[PDB]
Design a protein around this motif. Structure first.
Motif, mmCIF file in Angstrom:
data_model
loop_
_atom_site.group_PDB
_atom_site.id
_atom_site.type_symbol
_atom_site.label_atom_id
_atom_site.label_comp_id
_atom_site.label_asym_id
_atom_site.label_seq_id
_atom_site.Cartn_x
_atom_site.Cartn_y
_atom_site.Cartn_z
ATOM 1 N N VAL A 124 -5.740 2.594 -3.008
ATOM 2 C CA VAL A 124 -4.750 1.697 -3.831
ATOM 3 C C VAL A 124 -5.309 0.257 -3.235
ATOM 4 O O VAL A 124 -5.876 0.092 -2.486
ATOM 5 C CB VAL A 124 -3.273 1.810 -3.568
ATOM 6 C CG1 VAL A 124 -2.925 1.400 -2.353
ATOM 7 C CG2 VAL A 124 -2.413 1.375 -4.564
ATOM 8 N N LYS A 139 -6.969 4.520 4.087
ATOM 9 C CA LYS A 139 -6.339 5.504 3.982
ATOM 10 C C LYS A 139 -6.121 6.059 2.599
ATOM 11 O O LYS A 139 -6.233 7.406 2.375
ATOM 12 C CB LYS A 139 -5.010 5.748 4.823
ATOM 13 C CG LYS A 139 -4.664 6.108 6.133
ATOM 14 C CD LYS A 139 -5.581 4.912 6.882
ATOM 15 C CE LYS A 139 -5.621 5.097 8.481
ATOM 16 N NZ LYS A 139 -6.252 4.127 9.201
ATOM 17 N N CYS A 140 -6.218 4.983 1.717
ATOM 18 C CA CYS A 140 -6.087 5.476 0.038
ATOM 19 C C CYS A 140 -6.692 4.544 -0.423
ATOM 20 O O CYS A 140 -6.983 3.160 -0.222
ATOM 21 C CB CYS A 140 -4.496 5.712 -0.293
ATOM 22 S SG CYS A 140 -3.922 4.003 -0.493
ATOM 23 N N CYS A 169 1.029 -1.173 0.052
ATOM 24 C CA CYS A 169 0.046 -0.122 -0.049
ATOM 25 C C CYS A 169 0.740 1.198 0.064
ATOM 26 O O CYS A 169 2.000 1.348 0.683
ATOM 27 C CB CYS A 169 -1.098 0.394 1.044
ATOM 28 S SG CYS A 169 -2.513 1.103 0.856
ATOM 29 N N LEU A 170 0.404 2.381 -0.591
ATOM 30 C CA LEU A 170 1.116 3.672 -0.683
ATOM 31 C C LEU A 170 1.236 4.114 0.588
ATOM 32 O O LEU A 170 2.332 4.511 1.170
ATOM 33 C CB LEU A 170 0.355 4.481 -1.466
ATOM 34 C CG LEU A 170 1.225 5.519 -2.516
ATOM 35 C CD1 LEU A 170 1.867 4.536 -3.586
ATOM 36 C CD2 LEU A 170 0.359 6.426 -3.106
ATOM 37 N N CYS A 171 0.258 4.043 1.511
ATOM 38 C CA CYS A 171 0.269 4.460 3.029
ATOM 39 C C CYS A 171 1.343 3.584 3.804
ATOM 40 O O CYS A 171 1.689 3.824 4.863
ATOM 41 C CB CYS A 171 -1.047 4.361 3.563
ATOM 42 S SG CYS A 171 -2.277 5.197 2.456
ATOM 43 N N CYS A 205 -6.812 -0.417 0.777
ATOM 44 C CA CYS A 205 -6.608 0.509 1.879
ATOM 45 C C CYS A 205 -7.676 1.383 2.363
ATOM 46 O O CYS A 205 -8.398 1.610 1.415
ATOM 47 C CB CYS A 205 -5.296 1.268 1.814
ATOM 48 S SG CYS A 205 -4.933 2.469 2.969
ATOM 49 N N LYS A 246 0.169 0.624 4.824
ATOM 50 C CA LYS A 246 -0.899 -0.148 5.581
ATOM 51 C C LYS A 246 -0.625 -1.525 5.596
ATOM 52 O O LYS A 246 -0.386 -2.183 6.615
ATOM 53 C CB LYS A 246 -2.153 0.205 5.273
ATOM 54 C CG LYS A 246 -2.423 1.643 5.528
ATOM 55 C CD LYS A 246 -2.340 2.169 6.733
ATOM 56 C CE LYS A 246 -3.360 1.722 7.876
ATOM 57 N NZ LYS A 246 -2.975 1.710 9.277
HETATM 58 ZN ZN LIG Z 1 -3.221 3.286 1.517
#
Ligand SMILES: [Zn+2]
Ligand SMILES: [Mg+2]
Lengths: 556, 51, 1341
Positions: free
Chosen positions: B39, B36-37, B19-21, B34, B23
């Motif tokens: 993705v 938070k985002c 995940c970009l975050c 995710c 997570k």
């Molecule tokens: Zn994310």
DNA sequence: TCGGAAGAGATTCAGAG
RNA sequence: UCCGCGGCGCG
DNA sequence: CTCTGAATCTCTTCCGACGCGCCGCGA
């Protein structure tokens, strides 16, 4: 990414970004209630941006970047010779391939090519991993990799085991016709040059002045069965363009056979009788008789009878020691008369063709290999060579040229008296120079081609000369009457770049020195021809691409 | 960047199941989004596909 | 007589023709043009001063202030050339310009200055040409190819109806400026005249004619000729020139002198013209039909009404004729249309024009040039005026003016670079005359028409671009703000100038990377001429006619040297004697003929003048009086050869070799072989590689001396003297007393380039070839370079060659070599490769050079130091580490279960990884040099500090040794001056040298000299200390490097490479060959004395390629070594030197009427012995190109050598011991190695990397990619039924991202299965087509 | 942020009304 | 691990 | 004397081998 942390952006990304920017600008000018002409200008710019994105350069001036080059739009990714269709969908790059400088190997059989050990190791490294684990010498792929990179000689034994029946494909760019790709059963040699059999090299249109060649290994077993059954050079004896065989000797092979079959009026041991070709070979090798000596020999031949049996016949015939030696390799079924004359290139071609029609494929293949071996060996023993004394200049030439120039002076002074128009004066001069050149060529050929030698009984008699360059031309091994004419006779008229003929022909032959003027005017034809071939190649390739595209659907 | 020409929330993650975050990091959550985002926990191959 | 140096190895010339002019300095064009570019000039003709004056001054009107230019000067280059090459900084000097800023008062006159400010601007940096004629850009050698382009001026051209194809002929005339818009004028199948500007559109010519300030009637009066008619009642008169009648058919009776006489229906002939001329007829009476069908020339007015009934270009309406005759205007003016001589073309244009007035035409031109905007009178007028007549927007350079006038036959030679009305109308008249057929079109391919543009012109053009950009910036700054409180130093920004000049030198198509295979290659590349480049031509658009030879190439451009392939013809080489005229036309020398005696004065000609005169052929024989032997001497004139009498000849060729370049000139016996093979040989000769040990060529051409000295590789004796000291790397020479300047030390030193990377990885080495105490002479060669021996070009090697087919190993041009050649290292070559390691301050932690490498055996690291750098001198092999560098891998977080899995596995999964530089695969060698460059503020490691210490020690010892040598020279001069008189030699001898310099032996000018040299000593010690301080700061200072890199390390690897089957070798006559077998020395054929042959060549190639000359070379070789062998034996028996002296004198005398005429009687016996020592290895023979040795002389030389007269010998086959029945040609030949070594090409890839987008394997050897199965091969497979191998080729081996994994698995498992997926490139194509907005999809899933 | 050949469109000439 | 553009070079 | 069709003229677009090898440069 790039060095220094920079990034190369694909032009498509820049076009997309421009279109995004224009869209954002238009939407902002719309949502904040801009005046009419401003939003009209923005939307016209947006339309132009979309045009650039899809087909930049299709209309008006093309967009360009900092490099002052037009950016490649999507359409440019499919159009043109760099396009996706031609570059990648067809003409893929391939794994399991190598390239190397080629080299003559005469000791190879017909169907086997000499492949450098290093290339073999690299290509078959996966197969070696496989067999090495299979035979239990290596347990894991890491072990196999580290073992092969240390070249523990057991890897060499495994490598010799793997390729024993594994055909490979050899390709020479450009692959003008399907013979351009052929299949061979490799043989391992130290060094770094791929070794070919010269006979198939003739078919490749290849030479050995530095031509490279590429090798591919088939993977699957159906593929290698295809390579063996279809592509193996032992199958491609007959060209597709015509029924005549493509595997035809040239150069040293033809020269050797021609020397071996040529007879002379008087030689060592003339007239004796040999009970068999083996005794002819003995008498030659023991040095008591020269190849050219004419002799009576007992020979057996065979013919395919009405039922299909090779019925034998035996008889005395007049022949030469060399001819008997050559006959000894001939397979059963061909008539002796095929050999009993001075064998040129065309004679050997028809001999191979008649072998292939009368007998099966494999006797013809074996016959070809034996021909190659014997021709090379006897050419080497011959020691044919070219010397400066060979290019005899017919002493008549000076007289003929003086006559021609006298006639030129006569016609020129006739014009000086105003008796003729200048154009016909030019025509007359050209005609007389052409006549003189032909006369000189005939004199040169007559002097070179035949010579006088004493007979057995002590009298002079004419016979075909053993002059080396003449022997090379007459055999058809290499050269032609034109090249001989240029080498010894006056080389004649040449054309101005417009195609018109200069009045004064090049009088000196190649053996004497050409003056600077003759040389300079001669260079016109040379650069004309080089530019000619340079341009012709492209048109030929284009035309072939077309014909292929039109006819590619048709199948029996 | 989000909503950009390479926005991972649209085209998928730059790396397999990452995940970009940050997570999630492994296949235990394979095929989830995710919070938070946007993705998705998937393979990089999807980057080649999605338009 | 010969210099003492040249007495070593006096080569035997054979040329009969004398030489009257030495070959010029071969590089002269490059050096002289660059000098012209940079050197000072008061007249401001060329270079910097001309460029500045062409733009300066700069004036502001609202600012009422001026920027003006005083002078320019070039600063000192801070770095030497070798320092630039080492550190990679462009060899450049600062451009300094003196500038003045002026402000006037605000009251008339405006010229009343009120303040002046002056200062020097550092407006840019500029490259300097090195002494060898090559620039140094970054770290690379670059040489600018001189371009050949179409000259400015006006040309006239015709097509043979190809465009329209009806059979007519169309004509067009074109004007080309140095800069600015083109114009061309054209006819039409309808015979209208059209004009076009930058090939934009097609418009009737009258548009411009009225755009020019001329009205229609003025146009007709200017272009055409006018005839006058009178009307009285209804009787009609016309005013006539009798010649005007010629051409017409006398269909009606014609009257003269009151009598009428015409044979009706018949054409008027010369008898009629003479009859009328003797009649002296003036005015005649003609019928109405005769004036019918005639054009109205001008407007006509009726005064009874104030009305006009006649317009321009109108036909004669009889109604109008009656109206004007009754009105009173009884005179009428009309034009004349000779169907051949006076075509009505302009009238037809005037009919078809859309415009009606000057401003109408102006706005139409404007909208043509500027579409999509509303026309305006001011806009059109300004566009036209600035386009053609703004001397800054458009300019025919002076050469343009000269050609323009000389093609228009005007007397003037100079004029303003801008066009004018008269110029346009004159060129249009000339085009009309051509259309009439009283002229001829121009031939542009002619060499008197194209022009050579050297480096200076391109440099000044780019600098002018910089100047105009700076001018715009300066005028902007003047407009924007104040004028008093600033200095022009800020006003001028150097950035555009440096940007333009660096862009030119780096980017430009003509700034091509230099090649350095051998000195000849460097020379020919410097001299080369290219037709391509800016304003040039493109390989796709180059038709045959530009490529083909043009008869004025003779003596100016070598026809032979052109490259092969698609570039042919477009690239050429200067002929040896050709030099550039100041206008850029080629120029050739000739010898003046004066009444049958050649004056031996020299005159230089261009293609035009050469075509005008008659020039005699070079090989023409002469007496010693200068009279030709033959009366009907063959000559060439006006592009044709013929015969002429002794008196008609105007000029004579200077030398036989003036038609060819150096590259061709080197080939011996060129006059005996075909042009194709000669061309190929000449080109291949460039590719030769310098051997481990140089060797002279036996059969040379004399040119080797000039080429070897003229190239930069050899060290030449710039000042005569005696050689004091020599070692492997330094030469110290004592200058003689007379040659040394007053106040000089009398000693010169040279330092040799010991070993360095050549531009094509070959070695570059300089070896001394003198010994202690040998005298040396001005222009002598002290140190050989690559492929040079004793100052003669030494590309190849001497081989013993037999022409004989041998067991097919020489089949089809293949070459078979004896192992003896390998064993002697005859063709062994030394190669240098350079490898770079870059340490970066990357994200996720910096990357550092270190010897702390993970997951590696310690034995490899032992080769490195603790810092991580290999010690010099260590042998290294493929796959080994040379320098250790390491990259951090970031966090690489592991879950605790993965942490314990790693722990049970071992030390794996480290956040730190190896990145160390590794030997390229298959390469092995020895490590010769290591370099570090590092950014400021970073610590110097052990390797860095140790190399800096050794380098500073080297600098110190070098400077101190220079001090010692030069001070020894200075004190030797002290001795020389003091011994001259008033000597105190022993009284000084007790005193130390400082006393010598201090003490005064006399009181006179000698003491002034002593004081002068003492001040010299003080000055030299002070400059030495300053130099060493600057050197130490320059060494210790850091480097800029690049963004992101902290430190770079470069390591130098040298490898010795050996001849091996598959290597390509070739002989000077152009017979390439791949070596296909090495042979145990026993097996090679051997001659009667038992010495084996070395190389066996196939003879079959010779007659078909017609390389007859090479055979002759072979014979000469057998002769040459023959003498050598004999003299060798004559030396080995140690007999009296007088016998060998007389033998050598005989060998030189052997030629018939040869120019050589060298005699030994003046040689002392030790010199004779040295000569014999050099001659032991064979007697080198010199054969000029077109006056070479004749067969009779070859035979005579052989006979003196005791060899067979035919040159053929008996030979025994070693492998059996028998004898070949035929004699064989065995001799000596000169052979080269062609830099296409097999180990540089052999390549193979099982698997490796894969590309990003297409997922196909990478391409090229460097990326370790695979070969390309091109579409032709695909068709080849399709021709067979071989479907399965095709499918395997496309899907699994190439592009299936999973199928190839499955295949690899199954092959490893030993199962040869297959599973074809889908080529990923197909999905790429689908995605691109969909992105285009076209929906495409598969069906029947 | 260039020359050549083929096709399409426009303009001109001849025949028919 | 990489999209090229320009340039020479050999087929 | 006018209108339509066919023919001719003008303008725009497409095409002019395959293959390897090195060098430089890259707002
Ligand atoms: Zn994310
Ligand atoms: Mg070839």
């Amino acid at each position: 990414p790039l060095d220094g942390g920079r990034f190369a952006t694909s032009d498509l990304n820049d076009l997309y970004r421009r279109v995004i920017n224009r869209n954002n600008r238009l939407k902002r000018l719309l949502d904040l209630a801009a005046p009419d002409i401003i939003v009209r200008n923005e939307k016209r710019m947006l339309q132009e941006a979309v045009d650039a994105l899809l087909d930049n350069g299709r209309r008006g001036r093309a967009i360009t970047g900092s490099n002052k080059r037009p950016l490649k739009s999507l359409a440019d990714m499919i159009k043109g010779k760099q396009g996706r269709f031609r570059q990648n969908l067809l003409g893929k790059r391939v794994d399991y391939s190598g390239r190397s400088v080629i080299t003559v190997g005469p000791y190879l059989r017909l169907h086997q090519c000499g492949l450098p050990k290093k290339m073999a190791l690299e290509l078959f490294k996966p197969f070696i991993y496989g067999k090495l684990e299979l035979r239990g010498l290596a347990t894991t792929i890491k072990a196999a990799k580290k073992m092969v990179e240390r070249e523990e000689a057991v890897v060499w034994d495994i490598l010799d085991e793997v390729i024993r029946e594994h055909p490979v494909l050899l390709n020479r760019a450009p692959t003008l016709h399907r013979l351009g790709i052929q299949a061979f059963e490799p043989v391992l040699i130290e060094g770094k040059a791929i070794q070919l059999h010269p006979l198939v090299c003739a078919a490749y249109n290849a030479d050995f002045d530095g031509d490279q060649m590429a090798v591919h290994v088939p993977l699957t077993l159906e593929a290698q069965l295809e390579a063996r059954a279809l592509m193996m050079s032992t199958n491609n004896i007959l060209s597709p363009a015509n029924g005549e065989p493509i595997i035809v000797p040239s150069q040293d092979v033809v020269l050797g056979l021609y020397y071996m079959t040529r007879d002379c009026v008087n030689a060592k041991g003339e007239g004796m009788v040999l009970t068999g070709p083996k005794e002819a070979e003995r008498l030659y090798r023991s040095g008591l008789a020269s190849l050219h000596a004419r002799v009576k020999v007992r020979i057996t031949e065979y013919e395919k009878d009405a039922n299909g049996e090779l019925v034998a016949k035996t008889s005395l015939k007049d022949t030469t020691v060399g001819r008997a030696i050559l006959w000894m390799i001939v397979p059963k079924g061909l008539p002796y008369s095929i050999v009993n004359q001075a064998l040129g290139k065309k004679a050997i071609s028809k001999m191979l063709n008649t072998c292939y029609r009368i007998l099966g494929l494999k006797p013809t293949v074996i016959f070809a290999d034996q021909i190659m071996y014997t021709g090379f060996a006897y050419a080497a023993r011959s020691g044919a060579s070219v010397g400066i004394d060979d290019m005899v200049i017919p002493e008549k030439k000076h007289e003929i040229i003086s006559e021609a120039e006298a006639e030129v002076a006569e016609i020129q002074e006739q014009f000086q008296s105003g008796l003729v128009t200048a154009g016909e004066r030019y025509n007359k001069v050209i005609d007389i120079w052409a006549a003189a050149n032909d006369r000189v060529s005939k004199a040169m050929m007559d002097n070179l081609q035949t010579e006088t030698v004493i007979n057995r009984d002590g009298q002079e008699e004419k016979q075909v000369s053993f002059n080396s360059i003449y022997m090379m031309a007459d055999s058809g091994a290499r050269g032609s009457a034109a090249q001989i004419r240029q080498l010894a006779g006056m080389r004649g008229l040449m054309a101005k770049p417009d195609g018109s003929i200069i009045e004064t022909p090049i009088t000196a032959n190649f053996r004497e020195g050409l003056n600077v003027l003759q040389y300079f005017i001669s260079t016109h034809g040379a650069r004309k021809g080089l530019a000619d071939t340079a341009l012709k190649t492209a048109n030929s390739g284009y035309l072939t691409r077309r014909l292929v595209d039109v006819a590619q659907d048709l199948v029996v | 960047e989000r909503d950009g020409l390479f926005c991972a929330r649209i085209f998928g993650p730059v790396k397999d199941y990452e995940c970009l975050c940050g997570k999630y990091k492994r296949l235990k959550h394979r095929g989830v989004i995710c919070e938070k985002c946007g993705v998705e926990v998937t393979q990089t191959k999807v980057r080649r596909e999605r338009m | 007589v010969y210099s003492y140096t040249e007495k070593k190895r006096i080569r035997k010339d054979f040329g009969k023709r004398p030489q009257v002019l030495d070959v010029p300095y071969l590089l002269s064009i490059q050096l002289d043009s660059f000098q012209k570019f940079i050197e000072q000039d008061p007249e401001g003709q060329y270079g910097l001063e001309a460029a500045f004056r062409s733009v300066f001054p700069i004036q502001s009107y609202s600012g009422n202030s001026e920027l003006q230019y005083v002078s320019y000067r070039l600063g000192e280059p801070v770095f030497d050339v070798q320092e630039c090459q080492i550190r990679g900084v462009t060899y450049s000097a600062p451009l300094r310009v003196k500038l003045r800023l002026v402000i006037y008062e605000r009251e008339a006159p405006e010229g009343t200055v009120k303040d002046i400010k002056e200062q020097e601007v550092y407006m840019g940096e500029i490259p300097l040409m090195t002494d060898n004629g090559t620039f140094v850009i970054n770290g690379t050698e670059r040489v600018i190819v001189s371009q050949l382009h179409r000259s400015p001026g006006v040309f006239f051209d015709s097509d043979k109806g190809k465009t329209h194809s009806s059979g007519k002929v169309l004509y067009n005339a074109r004007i080309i400026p140095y800069r600015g818009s083109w114009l061309d004028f054209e006819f039409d199948p309808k015979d209208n005249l059209f004009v076009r500007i930058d090939r934009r559109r097609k418009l009737p010519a009258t548009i411009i004619l009225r755009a020019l300030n001329y009205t229609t009637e003025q146009i007709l009066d200017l272009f055409f000729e006018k005839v006058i008619f009178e009307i009285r009642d209804n009787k009609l008169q016309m005013e006539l020139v009798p010649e005007r009648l010629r051409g017409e058919t006398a269909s009606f009776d014609i009257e003269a002198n009151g009598k009428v006489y015409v044979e009706k229906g018949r054409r008027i002939t010369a008898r009629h013209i003479r009859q009328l001329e003797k009649d002296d007829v003036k005015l005649i009476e003609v019928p109405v039909e005769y004036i019918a069908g005639k054009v109205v020339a001008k407007d006509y007015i009726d005064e009874s009404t104030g009305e006009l009934i006649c317009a321009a270009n109108m036909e004669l309406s009889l109604d109008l004729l009656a109206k004007l005759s009754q009105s009173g205007h009884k005179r009428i003016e009309t034009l004349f249309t000779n169907d051949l001589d006076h075509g009505p073309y302009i009238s037809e244009t005037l009919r078809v024009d859309p415009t009606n007035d000057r401003l109408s035409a102006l706005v139409e031109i404007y909208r043509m040039m500027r579409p999509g905007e509303p026309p305006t009178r001011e806009a059109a007028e300004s566009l036209f005026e600035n386009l053609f007549f703004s001397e800054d927007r458009y300019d025919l350079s002076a050469v343009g003016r000269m050609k323009f006038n000389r093609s228009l036959l005007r007397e003037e030679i100079e004029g303003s670079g801008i066009l004018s009305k008269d110029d346009i109308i004159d060129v249009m008249k000339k085009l009309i005359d051509i259309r009439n057929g009283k002229g001829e079109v121009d031939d542009i391919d002619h060499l008197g028409n194209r022009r050579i543009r050297s480096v200076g012109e391109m440099a000044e053009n780019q600098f002018r671009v910089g100047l105009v950009r700076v001018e715009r910036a300066v005028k902007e700054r003047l407009s924007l703000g104040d004028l008093d409180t600033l200095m022009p130093q800020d006003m001028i920004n150097a950035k555009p100038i440096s940007a333009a000049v660096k862009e030119f030198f780096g980017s430009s198509q003509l700034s091509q990377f230099m090649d350095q295979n051998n000195p000849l290659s460097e020379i020919t590349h410097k001299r080369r001429i290219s037709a391509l480049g800016p304003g040039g031509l493109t390989r796709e658009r180059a038709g045959f006619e530009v490529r083909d030879v043009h008869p004025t190439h003779y003596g100016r451009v070598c026809p032979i040297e052109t490259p092969e392939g698609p570039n042919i013809g477009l690239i050429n080489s200067l002929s040896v004697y050709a030099q550039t005229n100041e206008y850029g036309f080629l120029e050739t020398p000739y010898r003046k003929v004066t009444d049958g005696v050649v004056t031996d004065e020299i005159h230089y000609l261009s293609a035009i003048e050469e075509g005008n005169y008659v020039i005699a052929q070079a090989n023409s024989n002469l007496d010693e009086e200068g009279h030709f032997v033959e009366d009907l001497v063959t000559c060439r004139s006006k592009g044709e050869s013929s015969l002429f009498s002794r008196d008609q000849v105007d000029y004579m060729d200077v030398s036989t070799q003036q038609v060819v370049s150096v590259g061709a000139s080197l080939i011996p016996f060129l006059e005996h072989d075909d042009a194709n093979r000669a061309l190929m040989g000449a080109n291949m000769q460039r590719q030769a590689v310098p051997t481990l040990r140089a060797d002279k060529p036996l059969v040379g051409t004399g040119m080797e001396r000039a080429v070897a000295v003229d190239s930069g590789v050899t060290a030449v004796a710039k000042r005569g003297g005696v050689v004091q000291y020599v070692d492997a790397s330094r030469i110290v020479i004592k200058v003689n007393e007379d040659e040394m300047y007053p106040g000089e030390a009398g000693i010169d030193i040279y330092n040799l380039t010991k070993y360095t990377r050549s531009n094509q990885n070959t070695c570059i080495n300089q070896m001394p070839c003198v010994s202690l105490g040998e005298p040396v002479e001005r222009g002598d060669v002290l140190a050989d370079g690559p492929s040079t021996d004793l100052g003669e070009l030494a590309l190849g090697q001497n081989m013993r060659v037999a022409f004989m087919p041998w067991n097919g190993y020489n089949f089809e041009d293949s070459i078979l070599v004896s192992e003896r050649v390998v064993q002697e290292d005859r063709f062994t070559t030394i190669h240098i490769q350079e490898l770079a390691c870059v340490s970066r301050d990357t994200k996720l932690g910096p990357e550092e050079i270190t010897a702390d490498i993970p997951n590696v055996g310690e034995a490899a690291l032992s080769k490195l130091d603790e810092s991580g750098i290999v010690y010099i001198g260590a042998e290294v092999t493929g796959g080994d580490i040379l320098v250790g560098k390491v990259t951090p891998k970031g966090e690489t977080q592991l879950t605790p279960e993965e942490k314990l899995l790693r722990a049970i596995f071992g030390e794996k999964a480290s956040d730190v990884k190896d990145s160390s530089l590794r030997v390229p695969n298959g390469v092995s060698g020895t490590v010769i040099d290591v370099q570090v460059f590092t950014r400021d503020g970073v610590e110097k490691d052990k390797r860095a500090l140790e190399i800096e210490e050794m380098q500073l020690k080297q600098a110190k010892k070098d400077l101190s040794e220079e001090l010692q040598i030069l001070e020894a020279g200075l004190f030797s001069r002290i001795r020389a001056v003091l011994v001259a008189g008033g000597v105190e030699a022993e009284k000084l001898d007790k005193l130390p040298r400082d006393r010598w310099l201090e003490l005064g032996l006399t009181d006179e000018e000698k003491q002034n000299q002593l004081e002068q040299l003492a001040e010299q000593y003080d000055e030299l010690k002070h400059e030495f200390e300053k130099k060493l301080e600057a050197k130490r700061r320059k060494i210790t200072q850091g480097d800029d490097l690049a963004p992101g890199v902290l430190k770079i390390v470069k390591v130098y690897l040298a490898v010795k490479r050996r001849i091996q089957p598959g290597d390509k070798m070739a002989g000077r006559h152009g017979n390439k060959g791949v070596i296909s077998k090495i042979n145990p020395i026993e097996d090679m054929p051997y001659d009667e004395n038992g010495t084996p042959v070395d190389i066996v060549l196939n003879p079959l190639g010779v007659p078909s390629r017609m390389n007859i000359g090479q055979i002759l070379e072979t014979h000469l070789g057998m002769a040459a070594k023959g003498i050598g062998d004999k003299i060798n034996a004559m030396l080995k028996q140690q007999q009296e030197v007088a016998k060998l002296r007389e033998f050598i004198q005989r060998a030189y005398d052997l030629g018939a009427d040869v120019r050589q005429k060298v005699d030994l009687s003046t040689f002392s016996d030790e010199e004779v012995m040295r000569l014999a020592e050099n001659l032991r290895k064979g007697m080198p023979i010199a054969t000029p190109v077109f006056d070479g040795a004749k067969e009779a002389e070859i035979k005579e030389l052989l006979k003196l050598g005791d060899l067979p007269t035919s040159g053929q010998i008996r030979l025994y086959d070693g492998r059996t011991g028998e004898q070949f029945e035929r004699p064989v040609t065995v001799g000596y030949m000169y052979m080269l190695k062609l830099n296409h070594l097999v180990d540089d090409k052999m390549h193979a890839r099982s698997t490796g990397s894969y590309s990003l987008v297409t997922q196909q394997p990478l391409g090229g050897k460097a990326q370790f990619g695979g070969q390309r199965f091109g579409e032709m091969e695909v068709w080849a497979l399709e021709a067979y039924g071989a479907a399965y191998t095709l499918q395997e080729m496309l899907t699994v081996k190439s592009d299936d991202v999973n199928g190839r994994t499955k295949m690899y698995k199954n092959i490893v498992d030993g199962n040869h299965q297959m599973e074809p997926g889908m080529p990923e490139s197909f999905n790429v194509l689908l995605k691109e087509i969909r992105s285009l907005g076209i929906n495409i999809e598969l069906e029947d899933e």
